[PDB]
């Protein structure tokens, strides 16, 4: 078979990390696809509901309150060794034992019996994970405190879905694991291809994995590379890549203008949002602490800064119809849990913003054009990120809108922030105190609960709010009462309304994705529910 050439659009170097628990970014998660997507276990239907037949099956027992995972008999690592029950449990240790440096702790994992006490070092094992046919068998039982309504769906976050190669990694010290060749350039994997070579920061050469249990691929090889935003269209014009994933909305018209490509589409499981920095993360106690001293402590300020943006004007000018101003944090793909009732910051309202600030005592100084409260000037730092050729223009455009409401906003270090640096800034405890506003974007988990973005114990709560109303909202969505979908829908609506009113974050955009595919390629798809794409693609 053929030799496929794929890229992911990224202005930052690739961060190869083959262990899901230690990898935070969508870029490498996507590039890992041919190798098993960081060793994902379960197949799903097009509604993300688990089905039988993947690398493993999962069975829920709601009476016992357990999940039982059965790995295929012939599931192997790419060195021919068996994938075992212990490999599945070891994924949990990579997140829960703090020595590995994971940023993926969350209150969802507290619902596994014994896992909280393992995470704090009070227990030396995870009591709720046991092995009915031993560590070297194929079966794992996970004991919960309670079932959660999302457990039928991949991405639920209450039980994990990947394996880690424990026998391969057991003599690498936890503190060294993320930077070891064994999780970066020289991993074991379980997918239809294995990474024969990895060039740090740049590329992966994939060849078939002869130990794969499933459909054997048609292709001889796949190369997967990063390509910059400024070089992407020319790469398609010159046929440098057969497929490019992750392309920005601003290039969509150029891409449709090209001869020799089919352009695929999907509803993006995505949200972008503006964050306010309101606290710090306490690593010892695994808790967000909302104690930062800032004008952003004033609810009226948070709301005003949201109302002053012109997100619809930006989307109309630049996005080629692919971005839609978001009304809430729950995107359209989760159609059962959205409501046209919910009003957010999708319409600019400069008059309301100015009124809110006047009402809150932030009085305009007519000499300077900026507002003040008891001598404090309303000045903030905006950690805007590098993007496409329009990113500087768009960030300055928001600064200009904020000046209209008497808020002085300046870029972090007078420039846009590189992506890998920004991720370090956001995740490294205890968090930084030198930014006020930033923009985040998420390739969301395929189940709509946002515990793993905002729960009190999660470092992924980048602005470090900790609010009883929000915490009760998040818990209500996943409660036993939410096993009635009527109740869960109302809980989702309340959460969306409460997040918009508290305005600790402001929803920005929903999106459609697109991927150009050279006409020589057959079998590529963006359809959800396609489980064997990498084995089906050919030239």
């Amino acid at each position: 078979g053929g030799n496929l050439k794929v890229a992911y659009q990224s202005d930052s170097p690739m961060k190869a990390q083959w262990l899901s628990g230690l990898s935070n970014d969508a870029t490498f998660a996507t590039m890992s696809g041919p190798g098993g997507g960081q060793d994902g276990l379960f197949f799903t239907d097009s509604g993300f509901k688990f089905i039988k037949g993947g690398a493993a099956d999962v069975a829920l027992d709601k009476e016992s309150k357990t999940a039982t995972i059965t790995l295929r008999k012939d599931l192997k690592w790419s060195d021919g060794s068996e994938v075992t029950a212990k490999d599945y449990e070891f994924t949990y240790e990579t997140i829960a034992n703090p020595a590995y440096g994971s940023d993926r702790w969350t209150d969802s994992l507290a619902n596994i019996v014994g896992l909280s006490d393992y995470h704090t070092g009070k227990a030396k094992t995870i009591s709720g994970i046991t092995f009915p046919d031993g560590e070297n068998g194929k079966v794992i039982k996970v004991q919960f405190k309670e079932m959660k309504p999302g457990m039928t769906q991949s991405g639920n976050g209450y039980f994990l879905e990947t394996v880690a190669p424990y026998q391969y990694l057991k003599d690498v010290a936890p503190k060294d694991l993320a930077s070891s060749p064994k999780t970066t350039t020289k991993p074991l994997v379980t997918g239809p291809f294995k990474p024969e070579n990895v060039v740090a920061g740049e590329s992966i050469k994939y060849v078939p994995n002869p130990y794969y249990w499933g459909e054997k691929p048609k292709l001889n090889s796949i190369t997967y590379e990063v390509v910059s935003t400024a070089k992407s269209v020319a790469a398609l014009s010159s046929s440098k890549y057969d497929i490019i994933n992750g392309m920005v909305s601003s290039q969509y018209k150029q891409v449709k203008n090209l001869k020799g490509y089919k352009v695929l589409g999907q509803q993006a499981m995505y949200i972008s949002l503006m964050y306010y920095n309101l606290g710090h993360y306490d690593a010892k106690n695994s808790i967000n602490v909302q104690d930062r001293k800032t004008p952003l402590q004033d609810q009226n300020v948070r709301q005003a800064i949201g109302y002053a943006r012109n997100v619809a004007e930006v989307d109309n000018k630049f996005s080629n119809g692919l971005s839609t101003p978001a009304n809430s944090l729950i995107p359209p793909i989760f159609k059962q849990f959205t409501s046209s009732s919910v009003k957010g910051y999708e319409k600019q309202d400069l008059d309301k913003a100015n009124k809110l600030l006047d009402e809150d005592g932030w009085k305009l100084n007519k000499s300077t054009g900026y507002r003040e409260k008891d001598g404090k000037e309303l000045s903030l730092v905006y950690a805007a990120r590098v993007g496409d050729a329009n990113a500087e223009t768009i960030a300055q455009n928001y600064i200009q809108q904020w000046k209209k409401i008497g808020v002085k906003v300046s870029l972090y270090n007078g420039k846009l922030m590189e992506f890998n640096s920004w991720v370090d800034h956001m995740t490294t405890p205890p968090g930084a105190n030198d930014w006020d506003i930033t923009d985040g974007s998420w390739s969301l988990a395929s189940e709509p609960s946002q515990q793993d973005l905002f729960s009190a114990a999660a470092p992924y709560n980048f602005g470090h709010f900790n609010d009883s109303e929000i915490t009760k909202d998040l818990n209500d969505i996943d409660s036993a009462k939410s096993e009635n979908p009527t109740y869960r829908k109302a809980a989702f609506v309340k959460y969306q309304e409460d997040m918009n009113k508290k305005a600790y974050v402001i929803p920005t955009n929903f999106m459609l994705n697109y991927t150009p595919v050279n006409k020589r390629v057959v079998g590529m798809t963006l359809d959800y529910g396609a489980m064997n794409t990498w084995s089906e693609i050919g030239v």
């Binding site: 990224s10 202005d11 930052s12 899901s20 990898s23 935070n24 970014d25 969508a26 870029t27 998660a29 994902g40 993300f48 993926r104 991949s154 991405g155 976050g157 879905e161 992750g246 920005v248 909305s249 995505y270 972008s272 990120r385 993007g387 496409d388 992506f419 991720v423 956001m426 985040g440 974007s441 998420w442 390739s443 969301l444 988990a445 395929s446 189940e447 793993d452 973005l453 992924y460």
Partner: peptide, 8 residues
Amino acid sequence: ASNSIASG
């Protein structure tokens, strides 16, 4: 399936 930080 998990939440991942996107560059755009």
